[PDB]
């Protein structure tokens, strides 16, 4: 629930950084801010990798979900940590941005939905078992 709002917040931020508006495609504030900031740091320290993140996926509305699912399953196959979670959001951001660049606007809301569902079913259990998001804020804020 607030997981959905987390996802929309980060994606808005990343979209806004490239001149796009979320609106065109559709405490807890300490968690958002920290995530925004971690994602920025991620994208900065690995700017090269990130300049061409999703190019080689050849995203289409038909293949989108399967590309997304394959990447996220591999990313977490052998475990979760906070940095991998950050990679996850940053990945989602790159994916949205590319969609719009490529004029596949429809994908943005879907991607948001996929991340929200993945977060709820696959990550939140680890998150609770590991302190909740308030821990994230402590370590990465």
């Amino acid at each position: 629930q607030s997981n959905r709002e987390l996802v929309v917040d980060f994606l808005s931020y990343k979209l806004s950084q490239k001149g796009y508006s979320w609106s065109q495609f559709s405490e807890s504030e300490a968690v958002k801010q920290a995530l925004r900031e971690a994602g920025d740091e991620f994208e900065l320290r690995y700017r090269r990798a990130f300049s061409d993140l999703t190019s080689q996926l050849h995203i289409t509305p038909g293949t989108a979900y399967q590309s997304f699912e394959q990447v996220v399953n591999e990313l977490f196959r052998d475990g979760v940590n906070w940095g991998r979670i950050v990679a996850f959001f940053s990945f989602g951001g790159a994916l949205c941005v590319e969609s719009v660049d490529k004029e596949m606007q429809v994908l943005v809301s879907r991607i948001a939905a996929w991340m929200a569902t993945y977060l709820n079913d696959h990550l939140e259990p680890w998150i609770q078992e590991n302190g909740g998001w308030d821990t994230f804020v402590e370590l990465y804020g």
Partner: peptide, 26 residues
């Protein structure tokens, strides 16, 4: 196969970022 390389990359980067934030925590 291009999805493997990406997530391998994603995994490598995130694990490193996470490493650093652990060194800081000490």
């Amino acid at each position: 196969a291009s999805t493997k390389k990406l997530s391998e990359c994603l995994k490598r980067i995130g694990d490193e970022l996470d490493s650093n934030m652990e060194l800081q925590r000490m």
